[PDB]
Write a protein that binds this ligand. Sequence first.
Ligand code: GUN
Ligand code: GUN
Lengths: 164, 165
Amino acid sequence: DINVVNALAYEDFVKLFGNVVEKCPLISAAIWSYRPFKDLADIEARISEFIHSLPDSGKEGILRCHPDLAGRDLQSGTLTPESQEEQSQAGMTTLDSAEIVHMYRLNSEYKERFGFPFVICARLNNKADIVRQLSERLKNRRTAELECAIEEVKKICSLRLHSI
Amino acid sequence: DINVVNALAYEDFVKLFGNVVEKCPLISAAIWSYRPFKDLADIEARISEFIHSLPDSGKEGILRCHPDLAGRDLQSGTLTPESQEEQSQAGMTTLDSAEIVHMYRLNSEYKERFGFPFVICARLNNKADIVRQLSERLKNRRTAELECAIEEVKKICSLRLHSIV
Ligand SMILES: Nc1nc2[nH]cnc2c(=O)[nH]1
Ligand SMILES: Nc1nc2[nH]cnc2c(=O)[nH]1
């Protein structure tokens, strides 16, 4: 109900929507300035516009706020509730020993190449697609990869928003 | 050592500097793109330029990530380690029932007017100073207050950085 959303104090709006972009409450806090919203699509569009207004470093920064697939946070049970649901859904919590090592190596190569973590919309992909995509995007030039990666962020955000 | 800072993996740089702007690790994460940093001043300069490049809503967003002085999070013991230290140093952790209620009302008026929390460099102000600032700044136009508040965020950030040093 967008009417209830529109009457939210900023503190409650930030509590409700503060993690639609992983560890970036500033982004959802910002868009509250554009209330009232027509609908959830309006909120989505504002978030996309905000991300797009950022310098490249800002986009890279958003990426760096995301946890590795199957990395330290997943293994240590210190993911945000959203990342935990997403990573479980993509098969990350039931990887075997060889798969864990493989994800480590792939993540390591990616982050060494690009200087931010590998991000892919987990809810839209299964385990096998994830590995294929890691390997494929590993071949991208940095500018093209930044665009690709941010598109994945925007997909994650849309799903998060619609899960609320 | 700035050499040691420059050698940090982004994951470690974010871990160390991720809260120099309250609940805004994104800012520390972004500026790592600009390494090597010449010095501490370069880091602060990159932080300042990043914030300045945001739309006004982004600057408001940053403000909205800060907890109220003496507010719900302080009472619940759920402030960030830095925020707790800053507010304790400013005398917010030893207010009586009356004071706790009074902080609430001035903050309510302010946030209703401006649409973001009252932010002041707390390590540079005592109990009384804070109230006077709140009452004076309540008079500002919104355009001006945003600029005033963001300057305070940058002061807080500067001192958070120096504490790490
Ligand atoms: N959905 C999703 N994709 C990711 N890509 C990298 N980390 C994540 C995560 O936590 N969730
Ligand atoms: N230093 C400091 N100033 C503030 N102004 C409003 N909240 C805070 C806070 O947590 N710390």
